[PDB]
Amino acid sequence: HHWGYGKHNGPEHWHKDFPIAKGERQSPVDIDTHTAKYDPSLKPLSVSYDQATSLRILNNGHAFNVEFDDSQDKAVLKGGPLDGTYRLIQFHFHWGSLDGQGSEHTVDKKKYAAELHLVHWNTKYGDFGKAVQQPDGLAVLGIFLKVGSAKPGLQKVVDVLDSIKTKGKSADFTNFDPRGLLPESLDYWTYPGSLTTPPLLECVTWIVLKEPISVSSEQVLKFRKLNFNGEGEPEELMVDNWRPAQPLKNRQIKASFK
Numbered sequence: 009h010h011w012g013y014g015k016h017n018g019p020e021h022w023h024k025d026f027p028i029a030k031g032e033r034q035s036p037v038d039i040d041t042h043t044a045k046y047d048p049s050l051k052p053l054s055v056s057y058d059q060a061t062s063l064r065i066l067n068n069g070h071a072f073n074v075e076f077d078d079s080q081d082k083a084v085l086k087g088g089p090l091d092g093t094y095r096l097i098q099f100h101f102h103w104g105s106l107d108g109q110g111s112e113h114t115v116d117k118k119k120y121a122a123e124l125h126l127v128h129w130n131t132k133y134g135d136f137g138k139a140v141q142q143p144d145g146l147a148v149l150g151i152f153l154k155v156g157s158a159k160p161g162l163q164k165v166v167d168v169l170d171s172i173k174t175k176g177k178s179a180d181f182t183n184f185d186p187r188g189l190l191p192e193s194l195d196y197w198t199y200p201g202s203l204t205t206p207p208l209l210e211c212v213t214w215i216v217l218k219e220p221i222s223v224s225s226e227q228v229l230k231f232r233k234l235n236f237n238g239e240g241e242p243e244e245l246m247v248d249n250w251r252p253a254q255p256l257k258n259r260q261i262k263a264s265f266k
């Protein structure tokens with residue numbers, strides 16, 4: 009009986025195995041745009057993905073992860089609210105059963121159809137496992153998805169999902185360029201938070217982009233054909249794999265823009 013997004017093992021149950029679920033810097037949160045304060049001391053975000061080396065795509069039973077070679081500074085996030093260099097390790101999405109839900113973060117209570125998370129770890133801690141034990145161990149770049157025009161840079165991901173339908177399935181996924189998933193603007197909100205999945209560790213600097221990307225209905229429909237279950241088990245569609253907004257508590261959300 010391990011954690012998931014069902015009625016019996018979903019977000020409301022996670023605290024029983026992971027008491028930090030009720031902690032002081034949990035994610036996601038609602039971003040109240042009028043309460044977020046412009047911070048002129050925040051630098052522009054530096055996203056350097058030109059030498060990114062994707063390796064594999066994996067259905068892990070909760071989402072699909074596109075994994076990168078993080079043994080050298082190849083794809084890094086710097087600047088913004090961050091001190092030092094954060095290396096890209098993987099990206100994944102959260103999405104809904106319907107277009108009106110799916111994102112984890114919300115904006116004035118608005119839910120987007122999905123949310124892309126690019127996960128980076130602080131290279132002063134040597135490896136990801138050590139980084140997640142630190143309050144500034146990770147930086148996650150969050151990008152909202154709305155349904156409209158297709159995202160050309162997403163299609164290579166969409167096309168391979170048939171080969172990783174069920175939990176535990178992986179496929180080679182080389183030469184994917186994550187720059188094709190970014191919006192025009194890198195204006196962002198930032199706050200200190202946590203992993204949004206167990207173990208819910210409070211190790212993340214969240215950087216959530218203001219501008220959503222647009223994906224087609226057909227693209228998100230293919231996300232919804234994935235399975236939570238393993239091969240040869242009863243089919244449970246991988247949908248609504250998002251944690252709802254958590255209490256902001258003693259935190260301020262800062263904006264990079266006016």
Ligand SMILES: NS(=O)(=O)NCCNc1nonc1/C(=N\O)Nc1ccc(F)c(Br)c1
Pocket residue numbers: 097098125127136137140148202203204205206207209
């Ligand atoms: N929505 S979220 O907070 O970004 N979810 C994070 C998903 N997991 C990962 N993302 O990028 N690498 C991940 C990954 N290992 O590298 N899983 C993972 C998750 C928690 C842990 F404590 C350890 Br150790 C590993």
Ligand SMILES: [Zn+2]
Pocket residue numbers: 100101102125204
């Ligand atoms: Zn995530």
